[PDB]
């Protein structure tokens, strides 16, 4: 498990690796809030929601109906 | 002089049973198998009318099942009359007699049921009318206000307390 | 309305005339070929007869779509 | 005058109505020792027609999730004569009457330990039927009584017409009662409306 | 149900007279204690039967949608009285039937109700309360039944058939005039579509 989080104080992202219960002393990297190499992605962003809303999400009804007809 | 119930006792395993009264139709004779609950036996499944006045049961229904009384009450409907008269009929004497019999059966059933009760009178008094209250064993317990016959022995004991 | 009519149309029901002699059990329990006793007229299938209403609905929908597209 | 007495209908007024279908006169008792050869016949025809109409299968008289409990000692279920029809809730029926007890065709066994759920039509009294079905039953009974015994042509024709009208009314009553919907409310199409 | 003689005669005398005339029977003037006529009671029976049938046909002026049938608070039983020609539900498939003499909820398999049910009921009402067109239709149908039960007269049967058809046409006209029934803004589905 690799977990990165905001520093509780006025700091940058803190990154560490947890394998089984305890972390590994070797992995203690710290990255700036700007150049984070993990880069979560989202296609359609909605306020509140953390992520999701694929493009095919809002055409799923058309797919449902067409598949029913074709079946 | 003949009651409409004639409550029975299983007294072991018995099948044949008798009724003292007379009914216009077997739809007006109910057999409620009381004992642990007010279990009632319907017709064709638990009933069998071998012949008139000789009602019989499918099995014994002995006390081992918790049933001790099978009172064979008689109830005549007051909504489904046996003979209803029409202005174009013949007026058979059998019709008039059947009508009077059913109405008398309904009233005699409603006079017998109500007469065996305890309740106040117009003066505001409830009287047992000299009807001994049998079958109340264990009477008392936290001052329940009645004895069950042990009073005789208790008073004999208290008489010779000395 | 049009999509729901199409969904109605998708369902297939085999209407067998009771006055006929064809029995569906021997139809079902039969492989390809396997001459069976019966008459074709006995077996009929329910259909959605609502066609003219479909045509007028399609015409109105096309007109509305055209005006909206121009808009 | 100003009272609301109710006259009998269960085999009492129906028998009178069947009798009046022909020139016959109204009886009163219908249970009198006098056999009367018309109250008995009219009652028989009325009861048979009632049983047939119930067995035809209708929305109100079909009970869906009825569970039948086998006798514990014998593990047998009695297929009573009152059970006009007995079909499984699923597509295929697997229960039939063997001797006088339910028999499972596929399993080839009538020893049921837990129970069964089946769509069952149980015979119910004539008075318990709706007005439409009561009228249809009475008309059918009158027509059959006439055709069997009196054989009056014009009465037979008019009673056939009235039987057709009564059947139409009962069918419309059933369609109104069911409220069946081919859209949501149907089995196959309700799922398709998941767009 | 009800016996023929229980109801008093106010305008049912005209209907009974018409029924008796459909066979030649001369018109009575009492329709009461002073009848002693076997062809008057046999006409009132037909009139009552036909009135019940016509009411059970389900016309819009006697559907009385929205009842609040109440149960006994100590027994929790509603009574499916014989007067209730047809008891149904405002929604789709109805769940109320008649077991014994009390309403039975087949889906719930229980006839014990706490608050009160709402139904689309057709409660029987006297022949007088029927409109004029419905009274004429009832009279014509009762006349046909009386004639073909007691006398015959095929030509009279045909004439009564034509009169019954005309009376039914008039009754249907009255029903459509009464209801209104606009398919737009009156329908339960299209009216919502016209919201725009």
UniProtKB/Swiss-Prot annotation, chain A:
From the Swiss-Prot or TrEMBL record, state where the protein is found: Virion
Looking at the record's lineage, which domain of life comes first? Viruses
Record function comment: Forms the portal vertex of the capsid. This portal plays critical roles in head assembly, genome packaging, neck/tail attachment, and genome ejection. The portal protein multimerizes as a single ring-shaped homododecamer arranged around a central channel.
Q: Which family does it belong to?
A: Belongs to the podoviridae portal protein family.
Subunit structure comment from the entry: Homododecamer. Interacts with major capsid protein. Interacts with the tail tube protein gp11. Interacts with the terminase large subunit. Interacts with the internal virion protein gp14.
Query: What name is this protein filed under?
Result: Portal protein
- Organismal lineage: Viruses, Duplodnaviria, Heunggongvirae, Uroviricota, Caudoviricetes
Span within the full-length protein is 214 to 284 of 536
UniProtKB/Swiss-Prot annotation, chain B:
Q: Where in the cell is it found?
A: Virion
Q: Which domain of life is it from?
A: Viruses
**Coiled-coil positions:** none
Q: What does this protein do?
A: Structural component of the short non-contractile tail. The tail comprises six fibers made of gp17 trimers, 2 nm in diameter and 32 nm in length. May attach to host lipopolysaccharides (LPS) to mediate primary attachment to the host cell.
The record describes its quaternary structure and partners as: Homotrimer. Interacts with tail components gp11 and gp12.
Belongs to which family? Belongs to the Teseptimavirus fiber family.
This chain's protein is named: Tail fiber protein
Q: Which organism is it from?
A: Escherichia phage T7 (Bacteriophage T7)
Q: Which residues of the full protein are shown?
A: 4 to 165 of 553
Swiss-Prot record, chain C:
S-S pairs: none
Q: Where in the cell is it found?
A: Virion
Family assignment from sequence similarity: Belongs to the podoviridae portal protein family.
Known function: Forms the portal vertex of the capsid. This portal plays critical roles in head assembly, genome packaging, neck/tail attachment, and genome ejection. The portal protein multimerizes as a single ring-shaped homododecamer arranged around a central channel.
Q: How does it assemble?
A: Homododecamer. Interacts with major capsid protein. Interacts with the tail tube protein gp11. Interacts with the terminase large subunit. Interacts with the internal virion protein gp14.
Q: By what name is this protein known?
A: Portal protein
Q: What is the native source organism of this protein?
A: Escherichia phage T7 (Bacteriophage T7)
Relative to the complete UniProt sequence, the shown stretch is: 285 to 355 of 536
UniProtKB/Swiss-Prot annotation, chain D:
Pfam families per the UniProt record, alphabetical: Tube
Q: Where in the cell is it found?
A: Virion
ATP-binding found in the keyword field: no
Q: Name one GO cellular component term.
A: virus tail, tube
Any one Gene Ontology biological process term?
A: symbiont genome ejection through host cell envelope, short tail mechanism
Q: Which UniProt keywords apply?
A: Viral genome ejection through host cell envelope, Viral penetration into host cytoplasm, Viral short tail ejection system, Viral tail protein, Viral tail tube protein, Virion, Virus entry into host cell
Keyword field contains Transmembrane: no
Q: Family per UniProt?
A: Belongs to the tail tubular protein gp11 family.
**What is the protein's known function?**
Structural component of the short non-contractile tail. The tail complex is involved in viral genome delivery. Forms the 12-fold symmetric toroidal domain immediately below the connector protein gp8. Once the tail tubular structure is formed, the interface between gp11 and gp12 generates the proper environment to interact with the six fibers, each made of gp17 trimers.
Subunit details? Interacts with head-to-tail connector protein gp8, the tail component gp12, and the fiber protein gp17.
**What is the recorded name of this protein?**
Tail tubular protein gp11
